């Protein structure tokens, strides 16, 4: 809803956790990322 710019937030697909991935950067991190 409110993340920062250059994050997307994505869903797994083998299990199904919720997590964010920055095109930018080419990361991912599962805790709430600030900026």
Same mark, same amino acid.
Do not use: C, D
């Given at each position: *809803?409110?993340?920062?710019?250059?994050?997307?937030? /994505?869903?797994?697909?083998?299990? &199904? /956790?919720?997590?964010? !991935?920055?095109?930018?950067?080419?990361? *991912?991190? !599962?805790?709430?990322?600030? &900026?």
């Amino acid at each position: *809803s409110k993340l920062p710019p250059g994050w997307e937030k /994505r869903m797994s697909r083998n299990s &199904g /956790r919720v997590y964010y !991935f920055n095109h930018i950067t080419n990361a *991912s991190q !599962f805790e709430r990322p600030s &900026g």
